[PDB]
Symmetry: C3
Amino acid sequence: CIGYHANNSTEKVDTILERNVTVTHAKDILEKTHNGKLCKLNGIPPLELGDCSIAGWLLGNPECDRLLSVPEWSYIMEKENPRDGLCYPGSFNDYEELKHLLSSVKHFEKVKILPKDRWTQHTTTGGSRACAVSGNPSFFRNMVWLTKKGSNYPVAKGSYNNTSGEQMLIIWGVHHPIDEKEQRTLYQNVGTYVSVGTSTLNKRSTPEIATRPKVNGLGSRMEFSWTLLDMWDTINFESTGNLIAPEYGFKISKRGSSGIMKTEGTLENCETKCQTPLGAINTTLPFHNVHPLTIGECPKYVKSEKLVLATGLRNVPGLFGAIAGFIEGGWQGMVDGWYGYHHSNDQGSGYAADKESTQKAFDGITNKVNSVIEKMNTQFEAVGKEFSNLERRLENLNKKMEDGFLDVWTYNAELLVLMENERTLDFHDSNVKNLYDKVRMQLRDNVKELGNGCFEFYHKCDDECMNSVKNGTYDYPKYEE
Amino acid sequence: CIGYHANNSTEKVDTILERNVTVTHAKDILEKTHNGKLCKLNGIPPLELGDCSIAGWLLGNPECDRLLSVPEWSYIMEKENPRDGLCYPGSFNDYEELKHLLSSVKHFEKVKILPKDRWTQHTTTGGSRACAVSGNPSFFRNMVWLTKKGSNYPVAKGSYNNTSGEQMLIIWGVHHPIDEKEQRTLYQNVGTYVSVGTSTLNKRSTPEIATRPKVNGLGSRMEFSWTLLDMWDTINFESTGNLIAPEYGFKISKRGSSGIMKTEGTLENCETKCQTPLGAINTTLPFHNVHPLTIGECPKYVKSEKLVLATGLRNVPQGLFGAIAGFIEGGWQGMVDGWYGYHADKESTQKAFDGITNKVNSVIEKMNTQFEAVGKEFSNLERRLENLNKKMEDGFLDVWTYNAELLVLMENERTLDFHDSNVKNLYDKVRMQLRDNVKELGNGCFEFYHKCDDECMNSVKNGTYDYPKYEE
Amino acid sequence: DQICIGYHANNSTEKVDTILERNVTVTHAKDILEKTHNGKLCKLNGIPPLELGDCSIAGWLLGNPECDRLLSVPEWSYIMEKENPRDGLCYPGSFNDYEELKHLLSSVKHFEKVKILPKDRWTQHTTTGGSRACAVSGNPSFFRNMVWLTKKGSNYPVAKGSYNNTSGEQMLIIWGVHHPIDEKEQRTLYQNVGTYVSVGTSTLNKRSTPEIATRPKVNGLGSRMEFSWTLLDMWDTINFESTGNLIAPEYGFKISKRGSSGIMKTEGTLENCETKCQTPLGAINTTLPFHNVHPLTIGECPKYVKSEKLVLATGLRNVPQGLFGAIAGFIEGGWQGMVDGWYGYHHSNDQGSGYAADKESTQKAFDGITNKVNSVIEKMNTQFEAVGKEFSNLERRLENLNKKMEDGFLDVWTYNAELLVLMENERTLDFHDSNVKNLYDKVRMQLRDNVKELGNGCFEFYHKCDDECMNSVKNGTYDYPKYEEE
């Protein structure tokens, strides 16, 4: 008797042609588990900003004083709406761009470039209530609010030749008052400007005085801008009022660039190739469905709940008419493989598997499952991008495209599972119909072929004769009836 | 005798291996029909701008006075080149952005915020020939052209604390003259400015006086800008010349955001989940090819003329398993109660049918679809970006086409073979019952060596043949 | 006597993979991955590239004196720049909306330089302005295409100039603003101090103020020149007005276009060939749906894939000395001797041995495999893309959107094409298997009684089978007067 395997499994797969088909074995290829943790990424921690905006951190909001601050990070953790941004109300030009620039960094060191001391001739102690330090009027630790000394504001000049050996991120500001009287109180002079130069940059701001609602009590604003100073290049500042000067610069070496992850949680010291806001993924499968906003090298994100490839055969405690066919059902007793024999022997009967054809099948199904997994390229993407109020169009271009790929990968992967499942079942069917044939063509005359996949022997068949058939050696002196 | 179905069908499908193969049955999965109509979208009408640009509508070009104007729309209809834009020649900063913002809205109400009356101290009646109303010099209904009263233009001040309860779209302008003499005629003062403040916004414009060609007769221009005032926030205006002030604001609640559809036609009161400039699509198929510029939840747009899945079997009036068009040479037009039968096996016709039903569903149902706008807006200095969009839409067009074309072809070859296997299997089931008792003819017939009356014949269709026969 | 059904075999050591096996030697194959260029840069659809040598588009247009002798054609299809052209803005500066201008100029139907505000006519201002940095044979010179307006005597009267665009095509006009480092350099050149540079057309309205500021020296100058551009519509007028610091255009550029393409970063030079699809390593003259030459193509190209080989199997498994159990199955091995097709017979009898091929079923199979290989190739849409885009320093986010997307498509096409080859390979092998198991059956059902079926795909005849009887089996005509022996 020739037959196939069967077992306690209630696992269901779909094919193109049927659904809810119970199968002896399966392998889900949809990665759906995270570890609830935020982790290092390829051996390097994230910059952890707690509830500080990258603006507060850099500018040095006094409320950011005690942040981790590492010399090298791989992504950046912000909260969605950090609260601690520009304590003195304002704005920051090309902000989203700076954030992408800082998102990943090889080395990042703060360095004093235009020391506060040296601004003799101007007042340096300027501060506002809104940036309070223990109930005391303070200011952005990293900047210098240049105001009038006595009743005089001589041209302000300062420069810095970038010798540090790395490119440097320098940030500066312009103060916009609400009053041509606040303008005099601080700067005396009225028609002022704030000029800034390097080998590549040339900007000249004029203060824009204008009535404005109060934000943190102030109606005035401070407008910050930035630039990268190349190695061996010089930044030149010159103002006759309203300059907010940098005290420090930031050595910045990089790297490859990444992206910002919007989360509440905190670094937990683990390791992952692929980080998501719900947790890291340590996986090898080509698809996942944890969360869309990953950072690292991830499987393709898909809108699926399950992608269950069938590996084993139909479970029956096809296209070649054998499994669930002329061989009506499977054998739970044969457990040493997928296909096998049973024989009726007067010395006793039992369950022997064709290991030769179980090896073939198994090596094939292994290869199928590998094909599907290994041909899938994966590279380091950031996925979550930053956009301003005047970039909705662009933000949505990004969205239309991420949505575009979501649909491709879902349809393709869903169908891939279904087409390949119907193939597996049939492969198992063909393997059994072929075994049945191999056997049949050895016997012929000498057996009544029962039609349920059994052969009744017309002669005596002792164990040696039975192994002769599993051997592929049946031959063949018979005799009878 | 075992055999398969046949019929009058001349419908052709392709497979990977053959082409132009006549099949008993087929199901095109390419949606290629619209209804020539523009319709509501998910129960909500489009904003219908006629031939008004969003700039004219908002600014209130007098030529836009009588527009539909609904409190909630789902997309926006403009003509390609609306003609009625900035009747007083100029420009509008961040325009494309404003249009995307207005493309879809949950609630949109105009509201008077800085009433014309209250600008005592300045002249308010300013108008130009170019914005004529019945041959009469007029202006943007929604704005206030502040000029000098007598020979004096005192600082202009105005504010508005946004109490409406929704976020508000406020628009303002700056006038650039062509003459330091036009500049005096209207404003007296020469070194003027136009300052604007909110919690988040802070802008100060200076008028740029400069000789310029005439557009609508004027060489001067008006440069408009906008902002969204948050709830409970205040906008502050202050000018010493050249301000074009808003009279109204726009309450604007939204929503989800959509896009603008460039058409000539008009809303016809129907319903659709998916609108295209040629008409709406009421379809369930995963692919269409009506038009690239859809809005809504649509099938994937493909560069195909037909995607015809084969559902029935090869039509052979008079495969991979050697039965259909094989040892059983041709099909039977006589057997019409199913696909396979004797001389129909409803049991195996049901199996087959349920499978082919599932095939056709698999292909249709696994296709995700979501609300996309497709048609985007770009300025003259955004060609690079516009073309990024195009390279990508092109990118997806190629994927979906290649994939869907191949998908049809791979799955067709499978269907034919599936039918072939179904028949070779029927043939076998029967054969293994008879054996001895019949000469197997080889054309799929069995000649009985004994007598086979109707009960004996049902015994074979039953699966019950058994089996007292000793005849030769 | 005895007949025999079998399949083809040969000297081939070509391996394909399927979903189920790998490294499977096959009689025949067809790689569908285009991996060869011709090391050359070519015309594109019958039109040359603009060849900038080592000039930036800024230097070329502005007319850096170091760009004087460039090819300059009236119509190009893409643009060749070197990566870092060296000859850019010889007088240090910047150029607004530069990346956009480059995309605009990347492909052009007609492009003619035309003198619009002739140098002569700026009576009242000095015109000979030059700088050491733009030297011509050791002589202080300037951008050939611009006019450095400075003071005459000690007076700089308002500068005015206009041009009504009559040329008949849209015109690319470029202008500049000079930013000095000194309210003393500002006086030396322009006398006046609170100056401006105003520019107007039907659509454009810009007013620049010079920004004076201490700055590092670049090419020795601390001052800078900031250029901007616009397109003047037909019949429209550009108005210039300045009280100092204008760098005026002498020429305009008639520009008709077209369709727009992109810029190719290369070192080599145009070699006069032809290609529908150009890559920085060379042109591709191919018809296959995928290639892997280089990502930065321009023209109509196959989909770029991360593959080394995409080898479709066309012929059958090679077995010198499947899913239907025939090939590499009950018919244990293949025949190198049968060379007139894929499947055939061996018929042995007292008139000779000798292989026949079943040409009927070899034609079927071959027409099918031909169609397979065409399906895969022909259903692949292809259109004109540029692929290589231009982005400024403040556009890194955008540049990377482009990258994430090109990367997005790279993964789709690779996974899909890799898998496509594998799924279809397993289908071909099986298809050949089925063709043979079917031949074996067709034959078997004719014979029956009259032969011992050997089980290795041979039939030993129980009667005499002369050549006519053998052709009767290949014919499909075996019939059938035999009652030996028995």
